[PDB]
Amino acid sequence: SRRRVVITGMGMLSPLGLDVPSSWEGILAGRSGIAPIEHMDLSAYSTRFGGSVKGFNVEEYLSAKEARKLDLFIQYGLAASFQAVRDSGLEVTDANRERIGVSMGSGIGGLTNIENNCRSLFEQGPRRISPFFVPGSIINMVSGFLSIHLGLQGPNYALTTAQTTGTHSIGMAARNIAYGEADVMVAGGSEMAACGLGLGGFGAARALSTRNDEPTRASRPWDRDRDGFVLSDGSGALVLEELEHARARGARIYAELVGFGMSGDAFHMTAPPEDGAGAARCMKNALRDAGLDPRQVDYINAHGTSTPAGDIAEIAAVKSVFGEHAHALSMSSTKSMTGHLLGAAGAVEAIFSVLALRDQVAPPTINLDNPDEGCDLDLVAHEAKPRKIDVALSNSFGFGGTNGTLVFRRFA
Template structure:
């Protein structure tokens, strides 16, 4: 079977830097950090007291208060981003769809951890008041596939209804696997991405105990500093990013605006360590994506990196990029938007794919902020501290996760 072309026709984003795609993009280009002292709970006893929280978000702008009560916050964020993306795409929904059309639209919106705040709160209720006080909505409010489920129900989308869970590669894998479904005929349209909301006592406590988080409590806005010599760990963030993927001829036939083409997708496993990175796994993921796209390494101009601001991870990704792109690595613009959003875990690949598509669409690279003293071992062009106009025909997006899971997407200019 001939592989069908897949394009991006809708974008949605709820992020620490903005509650819409336009607001987020404007703030990214301006180098505005969304990271600050935690407000959702008292973080004073914790080693890390700051995060990239979503601010001023009101789920009742998207769904009813009654519906919202039966969902964890990660579902709220994912639903809102999906609704934005569907509206942006101009897709028909519900009764406007024919029975056949409804079966050709699917959902694949994942999360790395799921309803952690709901689990924490319900456990507290169980301990304090006993098992009869556990809500009958607890399980569907917490499980990861319920973003896809709720979006499907809201819009009458009866195609594939799944959710990917691959730690910090979740959102990217969801988009890549959804593109594959369209390429090989399982669907004509997929609503895909990732969401996360783990800025909570257990979320902060768990990552802090693993010594993964920055502890730069005196200056949160400069704490996420990918490729800086003084980086000391990642900053936890929350939010969601969702794209509408569509078969090219289907999009053309309905006159949809096309942001970019998803031309390649690669995956790999390190088979190395639970949490420590390995250079060869990311290299194989990037190489597989380029081969799948039919793109030579020297045809790529922009790479939105995983770039978490961890001492080992940033160096590892730099070396993997150099091993993949050879001499051309020095000509790439390599960018980490995590410097402004923090690390959204399962939501990272969602929002960062949105940002990569916007970089292609607007021909601009956002800055990597907080590079005050670039690590000499991290010796690529990271678009330090200021956005840059850039001719981008091909862009690459990386995400990597615990367990040695790696994913790479290749986007082409529409």
């Protein structure tokens, strides 16, 4: 058998806001967080915009001195993590600290830091490399610094599965609790890849929208005029908790995590298969894991990256899995508003899926002006749609054909 897992705390930095309720308000109003990137000469780049975190004050979380040691992606992950633990109301003690762990991941980790230290290395040689270069850049330092700050002695690890990271981190944290390896996990992801290397890296693959004239219209999942994804920064963290542990201390429960699916496409390094066979296996695995029939799904937070092939693959996957129910569920891409937070995408979209269940509302797919061939599902074009949502799915598909699906359900 298996223990039940609920969500008792959430935290976020996104292009829409410095916390969950501000981000969520932007989502339900169809606001874009996409803008030209500031304090950075992107003249020579084919993309000059994305989703930046605006007005982040790390000194709400850390001393100036401790913040200087950490890449922005670690600062963001720590901010989301501290918020989520505060939101949960959990009291860490000598009696429970071995039962509380962390799995905060990243797709691309410390690019800003790598970039600044390459400058020093090429210009001045190795003796100007910061002593904190390695520990201040490694992807497991959100889990590390969080565990040290809060005295957490449970399972301590970090996933890196590109654009699937946040979904896998949360799913595998849920397994830790379900199988009795922990009672509480802080799980999610963080990303800050708006450096030359991030915009340049994805730019060289021609994976990014180049709609520089209209940044807010660039992210247009399933729209016939989409031209690639929008690079965004931020973090999501959830407090996952064994149900009886949550009930005993009187925790506020947002929702239950009932299902986790993984699959590999085994198809291509960066492109999904046209028929989304991989995404379909992963969703079927997630529903089987939850003991749910495809008919019980009401809302899907799609990967919905605004790439030609990715968006169409997800429509095919959903038609395949859900058959005669495919039109009855609502599916939206909040990436239409947030852009693509890469490893943090699954973390902020799990929170948006939980909030869809709390507020009984499907967030919009903004910019869906002209649905493409075969994109005839309920994609919640333009505006939020209040509706019955008992069961919400959150999908992530990433480089290497790696797939993740989370299944959340209303808790009462």
